[PDB]
Each structure stands twice: as C-alpha cells, then as structure tokens.
Write a protein that binds this ligand. Structure first.
Ligand SMILES: *[C@@H]1O[C@H](CO)[C@@H](O[C@@H]2O[C@H](CO)[C@@H](O[C@@H]3O[C@H](CO)[C@@H](O)[C@H](O)[C@@H]3O)[C@H](O)[C@H]2NC(C)=O)[C@H](O)[C@H]1NC(C)=O
Ligand SMILES: *[C@@H]1O[C@H](CO)[C@@H](O[C@@H]2O[C@H](CO)[C@@H](O)[C@H](O)[C@H]2NC(C)=O)[C@H](O)[C@H]1NC(C)=O
Ligand SMILES: *[C@@H]1O[C@H](CO)[C@@H](O[C@@H]2O[C@H](CO)[C@@H](O)[C@H](O)[C@H]2NC(C)=O)[C@H](O)[C@H]1NC(C)=O
Ligand SMILES: *[C@@H]1O[C@H](CO)[C@@H](O[C@@H]2O[C@H](CO)[C@@H](O)[C@H](O)[C@H]2NC(C)=O)[C@H](O)[C@H]1NC(C)=O
Ligand SMILES: *[C@@H]1O[C@H](CO)[C@@H](O)[C@H](O)[C@H]1NC(C)=O
Ligand SMILES: *[C@@H]1O[C@H](CO)[C@@H](O)[C@H](O)[C@H]1NC(C)=O
Ligand SMILES: *[C@@H]1O[C@H](CO)[C@@H](O)[C@H](O)[C@H]1NC(C)=O
Ligand SMILES: *[C@@H]1O[C@H](CO)[C@@H](O)[C@H](O)[C@H]1NC(C)=O
Ligand SMILES: *[C@@H]1O[C@H](CO)[C@@H](O)[C@H](O)[C@H]1NC(C)=O
Ligand SMILES: *[C@@H]1O[C@H](CO)[C@@H](O)[C@H](O)[C@H]1NC(C)=O
Ligand SMILES: *[C@@H]1O[C@H](CO)[C@@H](O)[C@H](O)[C@H]1NC(C)=O
Ligand SMILES: *[C@@H]1O[C@H](CO)[C@@H](O)[C@H](O)[C@H]1NC(C)=O
Ligand SMILES: *S(=O)(=O)c1ccc(CCN)cc1
Ligand SMILES: *S(=O)(=O)c1ccc(CCN)cc1
Lengths: 728, 728
C-alpha cells in the first residue's frame, strides 16, 4: 500500500528538513535561536545559557524578521517591516535594544525604509544606508552622522549596489566594509546616470485603478554601464561640525584605461586593504593591495603589491575572480586560480612578489578557502572519490603542503558526501554541514583534536516520517561524450523495475559553471514526479559545466547555446537506449538558463523530446544584462561577437517548435530575465505559425515565489506533463 | 461535393465575399473603382466613363489606400502611407492631383503624418490636422494657413479627438466640421491635462533592445475627464498677417454646470449650427441651435431653440443621443427618440418649439434616418416580420404619416432581410446593400418609381464555389424568458442528424444595446466549427440587448453583469434540453464585453458549462473608461453605485472557476480593455488556487488583428474547444 510523496506533500512542505543555524561570536561561543529564545552556547563544554528570552519578542509589538547582536554583546538590532526588493536587497525598520539596561532605545532611532545596516566588527558602532546615503552612529542613543550627500533614487548609490552589481558582481546589496578594528569605513559609490532603464508594468492590488510602471537602471549586453568609485572613510574624525575625512582609491592603470568593475574588497589589517578589479571584458583582473600612509591619510598603491590574473581560454574565476585569503600579518595570501592544467587550485602569493606556489594540485578543484591560521588552511574540494558533485573539508599544513587531511570524508561515508563548514574565530571549532545524499546532518567539531563534540541536528524526525512513504532513489553515474566522461543523476521511481519502460523528464540548468548533478538531498517537484507519477527525472552536466576544469567549463566561451544544448540532447539519446526509458515519452524543463537550454533543445529538431516547459527563460542574449552576458559572450558588435549573439536566440529556431508541445511561463514583474524575453519569443513563434501554450504570472518576479503562485505553477506544469505523457 | 468549410478556409479567406463600394458625387452620379481605376457612373443610364485611369497610380511611396475627389471635381486627394493608431484614428501622407491640368501638386504639399484632412463641402478648400493643430489651404498649390497653436502631444488636441472621445463619443477621429458653403470651419479642442495616463510596455521588433512604454491619457471610471471647447472659425479673414476670427460656443447653462461631453455637431444652414451636448451622467442631453449674428460675428443661442432629452430609467439614446435631421430651411428637424412605450421612433420637431410629434410608432424601432427631401423621409427599421434582427428601408410621406412604404422588404424575401442604403445628393437614387441571410447582394434603384435599375454585385462567383462545400445552416427563432420573447440563432452542422448529440458553443456579446442575433450572412470561425467539427454554435439576445425597446435595453442599468449574464445561462439551459444537444459538452466564448459575460457565466457555478474562452475581457468596471462605464453604471462611489461595481467583477467569482476549464486570452498592447484587466483576473484565480490556461499576444491590440496573430488565436481556440469536447 504505502503513501507516496505527493504534489501536495511538496507544495505544503509536509515533510520538513531541519537544519541548525548558528552565529559564531568568539573563538568558542555561538548564538543559536531556539524556541524563539536566543541561546549562547559554549563549544568547549557543550553548555549554554539564555542570551535573550523570548518574552522580549512578545513585548515588541511587531513580527521580528531578524536580529543582529553587537560584537561587544551590549546591544542587539531588531529588524522588522521587511520589504523585499531584488534577489538580495530589501528595506526594513530597525530598533536597537540595550542588553545591559534591557530596554529598547527610543532616542535617535534608525530610520524606516533603511536599505542596509551593520555593526562595526568590534564594539558597537553602526553604519547604515538610507535614501542611498551612508550614516554612521557611534552610539545607539546618539544622533547619527551623515557621510554622503549625493544619494539619489535610480542614479547615485552610496554604500549599496545598483541592480547589476547586486545580481552579478557582489551577489549582495551591501557595499560597505568596516576595517577590523572599526577605524575606517570603506564604501563604493555607483553612478547609473547613463544606464538605460528597463520599464515594466506592476499591477499591484486589485484596488489600484491604474497600473504603475517600474523603472530600473539595467544595462543590457553592450549598453552603457554604471561607473564606480571606492572610498575609505577615517571614522575617527566624524563629528557634527567636522567635514568627512575620506580618500578615493582608483584602480591600477591597466584597468583604469577602459570600462571596469570593482569586484572584491578585503581588509587585511587596520592599515592595509586589498581591492580586486576586473576589466569589462572579464578575462583580466587585478588585485591592488593599498597601505595607509599615516603622515598624509592616503592609501598607497605600488606595482610590487599588484597581482594580475587572466584567462586566455575564457573568463576569470567561476562567476567572479576568487577572493584572496590573507595571513594575519598580511604579508602573503592564498587564492584559488586556474593552474597550468586548467584546474582551479590554491596558490600561495607573497604580497609584494608576483610568482606563486600551488599548494593543491590534481584533476579536481578546490571550491573555496574556509579558514586560515598561522599553521593550517582549511578548504572545501570535490577531490574525494573523484566525484565533482561531492564536497569535503580538508586541512593542509602550511609548513608542509604535502600534509593534507580530509576532515569529513570518513565521518559518514554513505550518508554524507556533500559538506560545507563554518569555523569559529581563530578556527578553534567548526560546524560541519552534511547535505546529502542521506538526510542532512549537522555536527560540531574541535579543531585541536578533530573529535566530533556532538550532533546538533540529525533529522531523526524526518527519517521516521519517510519510512511510511514510497520514496524514490537518486543514482549518480557517468557517460562518455566526445571522449570525455560527464556525470548524470536520475531520480528513480520506487520499486524501480529495470524491466519496465518509464517516461523520462530531463531537468536542465546547463549554464556556464553550472552543476546540476550532485549528492545533495532534496525533497523537490522531481521527488513527487518519481514517487507518485512514476517518471524518471534525470539531469546531466555537460560542456560548460563547472568544477571539472577549464577545458570543460570554457568549452562554451563566446558560444552560449551551442555545446551545452547539444550535450543535453546527446546525453538524453544515450539515456533513451538504456532499456527502461519509454522513448515515446521524453520531456525536458528548466528555469532561467535552464529555460533557455530547454527551448534551444526543443528548437533543435532532434525528434528526441515530445514536450518541454521553459520558465522565465532567457531567449536572446542582447536582452540580458551586461556583466553576466559579456562575461561569456563578449560584445554584440560586428567587430566582436555579434554573429554568435545572432544565431543563439531561441527565436532563430521557431520553425522546429512545430514538432513539439511547448509551455512558456514567465512572471510579469521579473526584474532579472525580463518578461520582454518571453514576449519576443512568443511573438516569433506566432509569426512562424507555431501553436504552443503560455502562462503569465501577474506581478511575480524571477522566483515566481509567492505562496499561491508557487503552488499554481507546479500544479499547472504537473498537469501539462501528465497530459504530454498520457498519465491520468 | 464532400468537403467542408475548414479552419484554413476561414483563416485564409478562401471563399471571397464581394461587395460594391461607391461614392455619390451628384444627385445622379457616383465614382467607383474598377480594376484599379476610378469610373464615373451615371445611375440613370448605367453608362460609365473613365474618371481617373489606373496606372496613374505610381505606387507613390507605398500604395494608394484611399481617394477623395473635391466637390467641384477639380482635384483629387490620394491617401497613402497609412499608419493605424486606435480604432478609427490613423495618420497618412496625402498628394493632391489636379484633374484639369492632370498634374500632381508638387509645391506646398500636405505634411507627412497628417492626422485628418477634408475638402470643404463646395469648391476645393482643404482643412487638415497635423501635430494636433489645424491648417487651412484655400488652394492646393498655395501655402496653408495655421489656425491653432496649442496642439500638444497627449495634452491638447485641435480638430481631432483624444482617446476616449474617439472610442466612446464620436466613433471617429475627426473633430472638424466645414459649414455648407465653406465660410466657417467649426472644430473642437480637447484638453487632457488632468486625465491620468494608462501605461503599458510595447516590445516592438525583436531588434529593439529595451521595450518602450506607451502612455495614453485615458480616464477610467470616476477619473478626471478631458474638457472640451467648441469654436467656429470664419475663414473669410484668414491671411498670414491676420489673427484668427473665431467664436467659442459654450453649452447651455443646464449642462455647462458640471462635467459634460460634446456629442453631436450638425450644420443646418450657413448661418445656423446645431450642437448636441450631454452631461457626464449621460441621462440628460440638450440640443442647442445657434444662429450667426452678422453684425458681431457671434453665434447666438436662445432657450426657444433648445431641446432637452432625458432618461429616468437609463441613458439617452442607444450609445449616444440620436442626431437631428434638419429640413433644407432649418425651421424643423426629425430625430429618433424613445416613445411613451419605450420604443425608438421618429419625432418631428419645430426648431423653436418644445413639443414634438411622432411620425412612426409600433412595437419595433427605427434604426436611423437615411435621407430627407421636402416630401419624404427614408429610414431603416426592424419593423418587417417583427424581427428585430432584420433591417429594411422605408419611405414615409411628410404630409401624410399614413403613407409609409417599405422599399426593400419584397425585393428578394428569402435572400434579403438585412439592408443598409446609400442615397445620391437629393435622394434621387439609392444603392441597396443586402447583407443576408443569403449571399450579399448590391443593387441600384431610382427613387422616382423605386425601379430596380440594375444589379451591382450579386456574388454569383461565391455561390458557384459554395455549392461544392458542406455548408452549415443558420436558423433564428425565439424562446420565452420570464414572460418575454427573446431571439436566438443556431448555426447547425451540415447533414444534421437528429439522433446524434452535438456539442454546443454559445458565442456571446450581450453588452448594453448589443445585437448578436441577426439575419446577416457570415463566413466565420463558427461556420468552420459547425461545418468541419460538427459543433452547434448558438447566440442569444436577452435583457440589455438592443433594438427591442427601452424596457429590455435598460433592464441592466446600474447593474452590468447581472441580468444579461443570467439570461445567457437560462437560455442555454433551455437549448440544452433539445434532444440533439449534448448537454455534457456546452462551452461559451466571447470577446470584450462577451469575454466579460463568458467569464461571469463560468464563474456563476451554474453547472451548465464545461468550459469557456474569454478574449480581452473586461474584468472590473473600475478599469474601463469613464464614458462607457459611467453611462451604464454611474459613479464608483459609496454615494452612488460603488456596491454594484464591487460585486460585478469577475474576480469576485474566482472560487467557482474550479468547476470549469477556462482559457483567458489578451493582447499586451490593448489600449482599450487594458491587459491589466486580465492580469488582475489571473492573479485572483491564482490566489484562489484555481487552474486555468492563458495566452498573451505580444504587441497585439484590442482586435488581435495582425495576420499571424489572427490565425494563431483561432487555431489555439479551436484546439482548446476540441480538447474540451473530446473531438479528434
Ligand atoms: C519561549 O521559550 C520557551 C522555552 O523556555 C518555549 O517553550 C518550549 O516550547 C517548545 C516548542 O513548543 C517545547 O518543545 C516541544 O517539546 C515537545 C517534546 O515532547 C515536542 O513534541 C515538540 O516538537 C517541541 O520540541 C518545549 O518543551 C518548551 N519548553 C519549555 C521550557 O516549556 C516557548 O515555546 C517559547 N515561546 C514562544 C512564543 O515561542
Ligand atoms: C551558430 O553558427 C555556428 C557556425 O555555423 C554554429 O557552429 C557550428 O555548428 C555545427 C553544427 O553543430 C558544427 O558542425 C560546426 O563545427 C560549428 N562551427 C563552428 C565555427 O563552430 C553554431 O552551432 C550556431 N549556434 C547555434 C546556437 O545554433
Ligand atoms: C488645459 O486645461 C488645464 C487645466 O486642466 C489648463 O491649465 C490651467 O491654466 C490656467 C491658466 O494658464 C492656470 O491658472 C491653472 O493653474 C492651470 N491648471 C493646471 C493645474 O494645470 C490649460 O491652460 C488648458 N489648456 C488650454 C490650451 O486650454
Ligand atoms: C450584486 O448584488 C446584488 C444584490 O444582492 C445582486 O442582486 C440580487 O440578485 C439575486 C440573484 O441571485 C436576486 O434574487 C435579487 O433579486 C437581486 N437583488 C437585487 C437588489 O437586485 C446582484 O445579482 C449581484 N451582482 C452580481 C454580478 O452578482
Ligand atoms: C559553561 O560552564 C563553564 C564552567 O564549566 C562556565 O565558565 C561557562 O560560563 C558556561 N557557559 C554557559 C554560558 O553555559
Ligand atoms: C555621475 O556620472 C555622470 C556622468 O555619467 C556625471 O555627470 C555626474 O556628475 C556623476 N555623479 C557623481 C555624484 O559622481
Ligand atoms: C556644532 O555647531 C552647532 C552650531 O551650528 C552647535 O549647536 C554645536 O554646539 C556644535 N557642536 C560641537 C561639536 O561643538
Ligand atoms: C580578453 O578579451 C579581449 C576581448 O575579447 C581580447 O582582445 C583579449 O585578447 C583577451 N585576453 C586574453 C589574454 O585572452
Ligand atoms: C487598367 O484597366 C485595364 C482595362 O481598362 C485593365 O485591363 C488593366 O489590368 C488595368 N490596370 C491595372 C492592372 O491596374
Ligand atoms: C452617359 O451617356 C450620356 C449620353 O447618353 C452622357 O450625356 C453622359 O455624360 C454619360 N455619362 C458618363 C459620364 O458616362
Ligand atoms: C504680410 O506681411 C508680409 C511680411 O513679410 C508682407 O511682405 C506682405 O506684404 C503682407 N501682406 C500684405 C500685402 O499686406
Ligand atoms: C441621472 O444620473 C444621476 C446619477 O449619475 C442621478 O442623480 C439622476 O437622478 C439621474 N437623472 C435622471 C433623470 O434619472
Ligand atoms: S547557477 O545556479 O550557478 C547561477 C545562479 C544565478 C546567477 C546570477 C545570474 N544572474 C549565476 C549562476
Ligand atoms: S456593440 O457591437 O453594439 C458595441 C461595439 C463597440 C462599442 C464601443 C465600446 N468602447 C460599444 C458597443
């Protein structure tokens, strides 16, 4: 009998996966929210005490969306009235609560509609952005000091990013960086004066008689980009009747000569800051390490302290160049860069010398550097078992790079093959986060002995619940395409009968450096499709995919829509020969870059796919943003790459859609992949005489994530697939 | 014969319906284009002569889409470079050709992008609107003289209407009226300064990197309306060094008192003009007959020359008050108004008296007055056979209202029951245009004895072609609803088998004064559904429908979405009882008001309809324009009709859509029923967890009329209906 995992199970999150979020606040203590109380845990012995009782929240009078405790632990910030903006940005109201006198501060309160706020790294100073300008509050009860006066809606942004820097460069809204001891406050200023505006209708509540027009400075491929300025403010002199003491640091001449982006800021010491810049082409970046000159207040650059990173086969880094990890003294740093074999590994650099020494090597890649001490460097890589979709924490001895230990590989080999980690200050302890293939497992460890101190969350509750349900299994393996081994995964229906022929849904992402095949545990729409509807859902990482070296990743350089699309077709062709696949019922779907590939695949005329669903797809590269698009395609000009921009549109393949059943879905308020992309695509299909189906989602953005829209789109897509597969 | 009328036949117009368009230019002559050239036909003898040979058309720029010969026959305007704007408005380029010299006017050319142009009634003066300002040219070869200087895009309109006046008041773009002998040029000025703008994206050709935002001053229900000023210009003094001599005529005090509209302008003599105004509420209108005062140049009104028309049960007229038809001397006029019984009939008014005398009466209505001479009045009515969906031409003797003769009733009784007419200058001759129920037939008659004279176009070619196709048959009949007889029509599949149970499609309009049931012959989508897919298509005119008296038409006053919706359900229930109808397969569809009613019907939870399709439906009256909406609903305020605005939205019935399969279609560039309406409806259905289908049409307007979109929508709707009806 047994219950299966149903669409409703997926949509209502009936089977809850638990996690354990902690905030390290010292080298051996972390804050954790439990039953709405804020508890202070001591790692040394496992004991804890109440840091803030939940009664305090009952007393506030508003739904508290989040909180942040001052480093000296004297104050806590309460965030409420949360209003989402783009992928990372939002605005909110904030109250500061005095933990000593356990009273709420009511004098000189933080303004409503605040865009960003952060405590200094030590003490309890605050810096925040409001109306695009920066403000600094030395004391929670004292008036704040305005730092910038140029902030202007849709034009000048001080301390927060504009749309494209938020989405494609920083992957954050914040653009301010306090120095380690709070002496200086660095910030970036973005100028969008010349950037064209994307405009679209937002309908709002039914009572709004006239729709509003949203306007966002958004540079599409080849358009005018925002400019940026970087400043370091000496906060020691801030005073109501004092001017602001600040110094502008410009990029090195090799980047200054043309359009560029600021892509990284790293404080090294109180008097040394590292700036990472990249040319608009994105195959040339430079790290500039500037020293504070105490006699003049300026920040000095030197050719000796500059480090260039380039790429001859594609772009630099995965989505941006990797960040440098400096030693405490700041005289050298470690950073992931492509080695001579095209694999991303850790290189050790001396701050004032240009050559580096690789400390890791092999046909696998380091994902990120997690922590560094005078004696060891901790990092995550997919070296274990040589599987690119796995992740483990390793520790390397700095005085002898040949001494490397895998700290997580053998803890729970069958249950845990994909880890992330979080270290306390000075890396004395670490939380290990196991995400699959079994149920997520959160544990705490001691770095001095590498003993597991305790299990923080093991998902025993979920485990129980799932025993009564017929869950599908997820299998990973490899296939060969053009002489290269590539990975795939299949979510297989319960009681999988190798004998029977099942319909097959290809779920696709496939963007540059994408990784859709991994050992992560997920309760997804695919889980329901396999468990209840008996559909095999497969994914494949082909050319252009990441974490397998530049030869694979850079294969689609300057030619998006070619090899990654062809590989999905070839992989599927091989899947359709495995014997348990009903070749009469093969579909493909994807969101975003996956919607573009899904559409390009359906437009290929391969005869492999009966139907497909594209959600919020890119349809023509000139419609997407400059930073992302140009990174992989260059400029849409005849002198550069216009030809490949032109024959990589989905519209160019309209005629082939006559042989397939297609469902095109898009939110009308998508600020990222504009509804325009699907509107131009449908128009080309209508012009070619192609019948297909559509579904717009009013006022939904790129995530089509409102609670009702989320339920609606998956329900609608389930119906479409089941009709395509003749499933009742 | 064994083939049917196919979707391709409909979409590609394989079967051509011919017509005969002529332009009367004297009391006995008309111009007609034959094989690209213009011929001058003599009605009397039937002999023609070349007036303007073909080939003379040097495809100037593009092609001549229309011509106009000056009254004195000395010149001819060629219209080309046609660029559509809204329903009636468009811009074009014009060339003037001298018929005497047989030369093209090469100097002082009409501007490119001219909004409206017209010859004076006599002679050959020209008046035209360009960039929202009026210009007059006394001679084709002479420079034009500017009349207004206030023209401003989206703000001030001189000589042409703004959006709402074009669509809802004048049903025309022109707002210029020459006096009978060309002395005066009257015009209206519209001021949209305070009218809110509807804004929506227009994507344009795929090459446009950023979408455009269209903005149109459009007053939704209850919003600030445009204001109007009416002027009469004395063209005798127009000179480059002279100012403009003009006089502004304001409405009578009883209308000037509040928001109002100018709804009619009729020149009576060279010194008398008739203005018809209506209050914003549209239940009070007044005709003001002003006389020119030769000593001061003023146009004077007098209470004795004012005629009031009001409605206590609804609005005035069908869509606006009917126009007065003055006698040659201007001392009296004839106008259609509602009877004591609520039937629209012709009343004879004395220009300076308040009481009028009805010259027609009966349980039927006069549709319009076509021509007037000193002895007779010709009008069109649906008196014949008591079928309101029929139309015939009548003549009534002015000195004896007992003498009324039907001129078209008996010409071809079985083939022709729906006519319109076009009379020569002194009503000496008239063209009769038969539109059905048989193939259209155009004929020429003489008024003297009403002799048939000749057949202009009989469609014998279409007839020959159709004998080989299995055509469906159209039948009209009546059903009794709550004591009243209402008409319906059914398009029945060929070789109809009474033993079979046919699926049924209700095609609905149902707006106030609508008439969906008539004896007009049409080759439509329904012809195809019945001929090829064996689907019966029916239509019904219930409460709120027109041409059957005010009791039926005003039934839905201040309550749109109630009785007309309920009557479609009740009528369908009766049809469902017929043994040859499969009551388990009934669908309903409509466009515009019909989309609204289709949606309201589907949301009624009646259990009668399995599925339906709404194309560009109104979904909430507060989103539609002020003139149309308020005419039937009053104001959306608590003191007036807010309660009925609130419970007549489609969104209020969202829950009930869970019982049906619904397809919602809308053009994103719809300037009339804004995409907003469907965007808000879809969001409410999503919010209620209801599944349905949608189809947006990029850049299509209210008619979804471009060649490829037209084919695509009907093809898509056909597949949706076949799927709903389980038809192969
Ligand atoms: C404020 O803090 C108190 C703790 O002092 C919260 O009380 C605790 O509430 C949790 C949540 O319901 C209780 O846990 C439950 O325990 C049973 C164990 O059998 C388990 O079945 C549930 O799944 C859950 O784990 C906990 O026992 C209880 N502890 C105390 C001290 O009574 C209280 O909920 C907080 N108030 C608010 C408004 O959050
Ligand atoms: C755009 O056009 C290029 C050049 O014609 C395409 O690249 C070729 O693709 C074919 C078919 O797969 C290969 O056999 C050739 O080797 C390729 N030539 C080159 C110069 O690369 C490219 O696939 C097209 N892009 C898209 C999205 O269709
Ligand atoms: C169009 O109508 C507007 C009013 O809606 C007129 O604007 C007013 O003009 C007067 C005189 O110049 C000012 O005193 C008012 O302040 C204006 N109203 C506002 C708030 O705009 C405008 O003059 C009219 N245009 C024409 C040519 O008639
Ligand atoms: C809006 O509400 C009015 C008032 O309740 C509705 O009118 C009633 O309709 C019912 C039919 O179910 C009749 O039995 C009553 O006689 C009506 N009462 C009145 C005051 O006329 C009206 O139908 C509703 N409109 C819509 C669109 O649902
Ligand atoms: C844990 O216990 C130690 C002593 O054993 C004590 O110093 C520490 O403060 C305790 N931590 C908390 C906050 O529970
Ligand atoms: C922003 O850039 C524009 C040029 O694109 C310049 O004119 C303006 O002064 C700049 N504003 C600031 C505050 O730098
Ligand atoms: C700053 O100047 C203002 C006068 O403009 C004065 O009220 C205040 O006392 C001054 N504060 C300081 C820092 O001296
Ligand atoms: C970086 O890209 C630019 C523009 O496409 C190109 O001219 C340059 O050679 C590239 N640099 C390298 C080292 O590949
Ligand atoms: C012009 O008229 C002649 C007959 O008078 C006709 O044969 C010819 O086709 C016409 N030219 C065209 C095609 O416009
Ligand atoms: C028709 O013929 C008559 C003579 O019988 C002639 O006077 C008239 O001008 C002709 N009409 C035309 C323009 O063909
Ligand atoms: C009108 O004004 C123009 C100014 O250039 C002048 O040349 C012309 O003579 C005037 N008209 C007359 C003749 O009064
Ligand atoms: C005309 O309509 C208004 C409301 O829009 C109303 O107050 C008035 O009574 C109506 N007049 C007549 C004659 O019904
Ligand atoms: S992918 O999932 O690695 C991914 C997601 C989002 C982005 C930002 C592009 N706008 C890039 C890559
Ligand atoms: S109906 O066909 O009598 C009809 C058609 C168009 C309108 C204008 C609505 N804006 C009204 C009625």
């Amino acid at each position: 009998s047994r219950r299966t995992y149903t669409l409703t199970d997926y949509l209502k999150s009936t089977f809850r996966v638990k996690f354990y979020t902690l905030q390290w606040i010292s080298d051996h203590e972390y804050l954790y929210k439990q039953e709405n109380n804020i508890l202070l845990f001591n790692a040394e012995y496992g004991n804890s005490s109440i840091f803030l009782e939940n009664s305090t929240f009952d007393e506030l009078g508003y739904s508290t969306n989040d909180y942040s405790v001052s480093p000296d632990r004297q104050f806590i910030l309460f965030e409420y009235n949360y209003v989402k903006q783009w992928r990372h940005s939002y605005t909110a109201s904030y109250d500061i609560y005095d933990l000593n006198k356990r009273q709420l501060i009511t004098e000189e309160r933080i303004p409503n509609n605040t865009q960003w706020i952060t405590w200094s790294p030590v003490g309890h100073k605050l810096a925040y952005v409001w109306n695009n300008d920066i403000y600094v509050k030395n004391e929670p009860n004292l008036s704040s000091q305005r730092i910038t006066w140029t902030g202007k809606e849709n034009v000048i942004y001080n301390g927060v990013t504009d749309w494209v820097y938020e989405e494609e460069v920083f992957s954050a809204y914040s653009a301010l960086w306090w120095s380690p001891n709070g002496t200086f406050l660095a910030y970036a200023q973005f100028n969008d004066t010349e950037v064209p505006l994307i405009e679209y209708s937002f309908y709002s509540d039914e009572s709004l008689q006239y729709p509003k027009t949203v306007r966002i400075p958004y540079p599409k491929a080849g358009a005018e980009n925002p400019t940026v300025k970087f400043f370091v403010v000496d906060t020691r002199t801030l005073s109501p009747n004092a001017s602001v003491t600040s110094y502008q640091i410009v990029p090195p001449a090799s980047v200054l000569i043309g359009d560029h982006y600021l892509c990284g800021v790293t404080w090294v010491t109180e008097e040394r800051i590292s700036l990472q810049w990249i040319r608009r082409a994105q195959n040339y970046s430079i790290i500039d390490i500037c020293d504070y000159d105490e006699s003049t207040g300026r920040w000095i650059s030197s050719v000796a302290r500059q480090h260039i990173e380039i790429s001859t086969t594609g772009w630099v880094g995965r989505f941006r160049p990797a960040e440098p990890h400096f030693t405490s003294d700041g005289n050298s740093f470690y950073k992931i860069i492509s080695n001579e074999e095209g694999y991303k590994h850790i290189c050790h650099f001396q701050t004032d010398k240009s050559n580096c020494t690789f400390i890791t090597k092999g046909a696998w890649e380091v994902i990120g550097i997690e922590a560094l001490t005078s004696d060891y460097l901790y990092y995550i890589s997919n070296e274990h078992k040589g599987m690119p979709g796995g992740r483990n924490l390793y520790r390397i001895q700095l005085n002898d790079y040949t001494k490397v230990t895998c700290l997580s590989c053998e803890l729970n080999p069958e249950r845990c093959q994909y880890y992330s980690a979080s270290f306390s200050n000075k890396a004395k302890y670490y939380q290990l986060r196991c995400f699959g293939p079994g149920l997520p497992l959160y544990t705490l460890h001691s770095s001095s002995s590498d003993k597991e101190l305790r299990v923080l969350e093991d998902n025993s509750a979920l485990d129980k619940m799932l025993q009564d349900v017929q869950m599908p299994s997820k299998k990973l393996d490899v296939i060969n395409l053009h002489g290269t081994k590539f990975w795939y995964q299949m979510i297989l229906p319960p009681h999988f009968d190798k004998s029977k022929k099942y319909p097959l849904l290809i779920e696709v992402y496939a963007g540059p450096c994408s990784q859709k095949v991994d050992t992560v545990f997920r309760l997804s729409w695919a889980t329901y499709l396999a468990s209840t509807e008996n559909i095999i859902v497969a994914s494949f990482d082909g050319r252009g995919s990441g974490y397998q070296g530049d030869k694979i990743m850079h294969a689609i350089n300057r030619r998006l829509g070619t090899f990654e699309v062809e590989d999905q077709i070839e992989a599927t062709r091989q899947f359709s020969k495995m014997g348990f696949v009903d070749d009469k019922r093969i579909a493909i779907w994807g969101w975003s870059y996956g919607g573009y590939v899904t559409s390009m695949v359906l437009g290929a005329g391969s005869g492999v796919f009966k139907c497909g669903i594209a959600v919020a797809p890119v349809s023509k590269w000139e419609y997407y943003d400059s930073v992302y698009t140009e990174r992989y395609m260059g400029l849409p000009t005849p002198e550069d790459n216009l030809d490949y921009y032109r024959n990589s549109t989905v519209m160019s393949r309209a005629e082939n859609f006559k042989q397939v059943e297609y469902l095109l879905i898009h939110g009308t308020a998508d600020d990222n992949v504009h509804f325009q992309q699907s509107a131009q695509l449908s128009k080309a299909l209508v012009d070619a005489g192609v019948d297909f189906q559509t579904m717009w989602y009013t006022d939904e953005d790129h995530g089509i994530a409102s609670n009702m829209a989320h339920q609606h789109i998956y329900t609608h897509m389930s119906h479409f697939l089941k009709q395509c597969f003749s499933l009742p």
